[PDB]
Amino acid sequence: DVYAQEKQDFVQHFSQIVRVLTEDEHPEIGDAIARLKEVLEYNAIGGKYNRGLTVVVAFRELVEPRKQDADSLQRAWTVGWCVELLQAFFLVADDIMDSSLTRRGQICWYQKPGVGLDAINDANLLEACIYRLLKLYCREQPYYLNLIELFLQSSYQTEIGQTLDLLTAPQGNVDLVRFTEKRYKSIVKYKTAFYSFYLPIAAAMYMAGIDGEKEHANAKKILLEMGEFFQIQDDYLDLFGDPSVTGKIGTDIQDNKCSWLVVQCLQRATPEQYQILKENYGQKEAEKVARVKALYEELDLPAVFLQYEEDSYSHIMALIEQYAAPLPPAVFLGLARKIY
Amino acid sequence: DVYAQEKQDFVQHFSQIVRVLTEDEHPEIGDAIARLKEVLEYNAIGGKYNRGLTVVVAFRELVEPRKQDADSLQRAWTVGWCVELLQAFFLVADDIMDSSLTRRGQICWYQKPGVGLDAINDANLLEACIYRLLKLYCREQPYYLNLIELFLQSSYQTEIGQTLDLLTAPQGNVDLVRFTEKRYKSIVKYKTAFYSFYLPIAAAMYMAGIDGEKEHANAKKILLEMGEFFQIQDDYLDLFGDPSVTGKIGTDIQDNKCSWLVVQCLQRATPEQYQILKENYGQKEAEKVARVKALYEELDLPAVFLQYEEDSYSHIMALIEQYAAPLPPAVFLGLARKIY
Ligand SMILES: O=P(O)(O)C1(P(=O)(O)O)Cc2cccnc2C1
Ligand SMILES: O=P(O)(O)C1(P(=O)(O)O)Cc2cccnc2C1
Ligand SMILES: [Mg+2]
Ligand SMILES: [Mg+2]
Ligand SMILES: [Mg+2]
Ligand SMILES: [Mg+2]
Ligand SMILES: [Mg+2]
Ligand SMILES: [Mg+2]
Numbered sequence: 001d002v003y004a005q006e007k008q009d010f011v012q013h014f015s016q017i018v019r020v021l022t023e024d025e026h027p028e029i030g031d032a033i034a035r036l037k038e039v040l041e042y043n044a045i046g047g048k049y050n051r052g053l054t055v056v057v058a059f060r061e062l063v064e065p066r067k068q069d070a071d072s073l074q075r076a077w078t079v080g081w082c083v084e085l086l087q088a089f090f091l092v093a094d095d096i097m098d099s100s101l102t103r104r105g106q107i108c109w110y111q112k113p114g115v116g117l118d119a120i121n122d123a124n125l126l127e128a129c130i131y132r133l134l135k136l137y138c139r140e141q142p143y144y145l146n147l148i149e150l151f152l153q154s155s156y157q158t159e160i161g162q163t164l165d166l167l168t169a170p171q172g173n174v175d176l177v178r179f180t181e182k183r184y185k186s187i188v189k190y191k192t193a194f195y196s197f198y199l200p201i202a203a204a205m206y207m208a209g210i211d212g213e214k215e216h217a218n219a220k221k222i223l224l225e226m227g228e229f230f231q232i233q234d235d236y237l238d239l240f241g242d243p244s245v246t247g248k249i250g251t252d253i254q255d256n257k258c259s260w261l262v263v264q265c266l267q268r269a270t271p272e273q274y275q276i277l278k279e280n281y282g283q284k285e286a287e288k289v290a291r292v293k294a295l296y297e298e299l300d301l302p303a304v305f306l307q308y309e310e311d312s313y314s315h316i317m318a319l320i321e322q323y324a325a326p327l328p329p330a331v332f333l334g335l336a337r338k339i340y
Numbered sequence: 341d342v343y344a345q346e347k348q349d350f351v352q353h354f355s356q357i358v359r360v361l362t363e364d365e366h367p368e369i370g371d372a373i374a375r376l377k378e379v380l381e382y383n384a385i386g387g388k389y390n391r392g393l394t395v396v397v398a399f400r401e402l403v404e405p406r407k408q409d410a411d412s413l414q415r416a417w418t419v420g421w422c423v424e425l426l427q428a429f430f431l432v433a434d435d436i437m438d439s440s441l442t443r444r445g446q447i448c449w450y451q452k453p454g455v456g457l458d459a460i461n462d463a464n465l466l467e468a469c470i471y472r473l474l475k476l477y478c479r480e481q482p483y484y485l486n487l488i489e490l491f492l493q494s495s496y497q498t499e500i501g502q503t504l505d506l507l508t509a510p511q512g513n514v515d516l517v518r519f520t521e522k523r524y525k526s527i528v529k530y531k532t533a534f535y536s537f538y539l540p541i542a543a544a545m546y547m548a549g550i551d552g553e554k555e556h557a558n559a560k561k562i563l564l565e566m567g568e569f570f571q572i573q574d575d576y577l578d579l580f581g582d583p584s585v586t587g588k589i590g591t592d593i594q595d596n597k598c599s600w601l602v603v604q605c606l607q608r609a610t611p612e613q614y615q616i617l618k619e620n621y622g623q624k625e626a627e628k629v630a631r632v633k634a635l636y637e638e639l640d641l642p643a644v645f646l647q648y649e650e651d652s653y654s655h656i657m658a659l660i661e662q663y664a665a666p667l668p669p670a671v672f673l674g675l676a677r678k679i680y
Contacts, residue, residue, distance in 0.1 A: 028526035
């Protein structure tokens with residue numbers, strides 16, 4: 001795919017990212033800059049890079065090839081890495097707050113001996129690197145302020161979404177009463193859809209000089225729906241995915257989360273299955289978690305998900321028919337192929 | 341003082357800040373916006389406001405009174421609150437990472453039943469509010485990008501400083517060998533001096549149309565030295581200050597910190613006092629902490645600090661003589677009176 005053939009160059013650009021960001025030497029900060037290097041290497045590397053590559057792929061498809069200079073392609077790869085760094089910031093903090101164990105096939109940063117809650121500041125540093133990179137690479141470009149504002153707004157929206165995620169999942173309480181489809185859709189729009197799907201395409205758009213309100217609004221209409229599916233898939237895989245593939249161990253049941261699975265469970269459960277859920281959800285005991293997973297299987301939730309994926313795929317394609325123009329449909333099609 | 345007579349209006353502006361920031365209602369995010377309100381009220385209120393008031397005071401002294409519109413004064417009070425919000429973001433995270441107990445006369449946010457590590461996301465939200473406010477109030481102003489860049493750069497510098505703070509104070513280790521005057525001065529320049537002293541005056545400068553490199557450089561020369569003293573004072577008060585006055589309980593000894601006190605101790609200690617330090621520092625036991633405090637008193641560190649405050653005050657005033665022009669000396673004098 002077009003993600004395949006952009007990958008290698010994009011990934012190789014990381015050493016350049018790290019080089020430029022370690023050159024703040026101010027010899028006095030040398031030890032901190034070395035810590036930053038370590039943090040970047042542990043937390044920005046080892047996933048699929050789909051968000052960052054999305055910026056690069058869309059940039060190649062929206063920019064006139066004659067305008068695809070060496071320099072403007074360096075900027076695209078940099079802006080792609082900015083998206084990956086935003087992801088790394090949110091994931092470092094999220095793993096702490098979700099009490100997670102592994103991520104991307106290694107133990108979570110904060111679980112590393114000698115890191116612990118110092119990881120909070122490491123996460124803030126990852127965030128800071130975004131704006132340092134934008135200044136360094138894009139400061140003289142017409143779209144500079146547009147990109148700054150887009151990244152900050154996307155961060156605010158994600159943080160609002162994380163807020164709702166955490167409010168809906170208070171530790172060691174109950175009501176399943178909070179866990180509604182309406183609540184779920186709002187959580188995921190905010191925590192996932194904006195930064196994972198809107199951000200990378202929007203950033204490429206602005207870089208291509210496409211700054212129009214209506215063009216961004218139509219793009220957003222497709223991309224936010226993609227983002228909802230992606231988070232539903234993430235919730236499904238939390239329980240039913242293979243950790244060798246996902247790279248991480250699920251914590252949604254123990255964490256009392258408004259997962260798509262629990263929302264679907266509740267919609268289907270008999271009064272008696274409800275009581276089993278209520279007695280077993282939101283608790284660390286492996287035995288109780290296993291009971292929840294058994295309920296989910298009794299209700300054929302995996303089959304519900306497979307049906308949903310089909311209906312969602314067809315809906316997203318219908319939206320691309322409606323909303324893609326005047327942008328190349330390929331911009332959306334490539335993305336949808338990556339996620340579905 | 342001029343801080344006295346700006347205070348009331350500045351503090352009253354907070355309800356307006358909170359009002360404008362809760363009006364994102366998107367009914368769906370209502371619960372998150374209510375959490376944000378709670379976070380703002382707990383974490384942005386109850387200190388002395390000296391950083392935010394500094395923006396307002398310097399704005400009144402650098403801007404032509406004829407240009408001090410109703411609107412431009414609303415912007416100054418807003419930019420002042422932006423500085424206070426930046427402070428709140430850093431303090432929420434710092435209390436978690438320093439395992440602190442109280443702040444500003446109440447228990448730390450993260451220690452509140454039902455908050456815990458969710459406070460990490462609350463802190464990120466406080467950060468986000470800065471840029472939301474700058475957009476809302478300042479977006480059409482010539483200095484808009486200057487203020488965005490200043491706040492981001494100040495955050496990056498503070499985070500670099502926090503990095504060095506934490507690297508120098510590894511939990512449950514030793515060497516006092518790390519604790520040198522050189523290391524100390526670099527920590528505090530970065531973690532304190534930029535955001536506490538340079539930021540608020542710089543922000544007022546940019547708002548006044550003073551964007552010149554040399555003017556900012558000369559201002560920085562005074563303000564960074566003030567910031568070093570302020571952090572030395574903060575370290576002194578951590579142990580020897582009255583909690584009813586400081587609002588918080590000290591943790592520097594237990595936290596193994598490169599405090600000014602330990603650096604001064606080491607410079608003075610006999611080989612035998614060194615061994616007492618090494619045996620007792622960096623540990624939670626009240627008895628061991630008391631032994632450290634006893635060593636500090638044996639070495640007359642409080643008297644060393646009082647002498648230092650005098651020498652520092654005289655040095656800062658000498659710098660204001662050298663470097664203040666063409667800005668009103670009052671801008672620096674008022675600040676120095678507040679801290680000394
Ligand atoms: O931990 P992961 O499953 O990767 C998780 P969540 O914790 O939201 O499930 C972290 C995260 C953060 C923002 C948007 N989606 C996600 C997925
Ligand atoms: O906790 P406080 O004493 O308020 C502290 P530090 O933890 O650095 O001593 C927090 C903080 C953060 C940045 C600059 N100075 C300070 C003072
Ligand atoms: Mg998680
Ligand atoms: Mg999460
Ligand atoms: Mg998940
Ligand atoms: Mg502290
Ligand atoms: Mg600290
Ligand atoms: Mg302190």
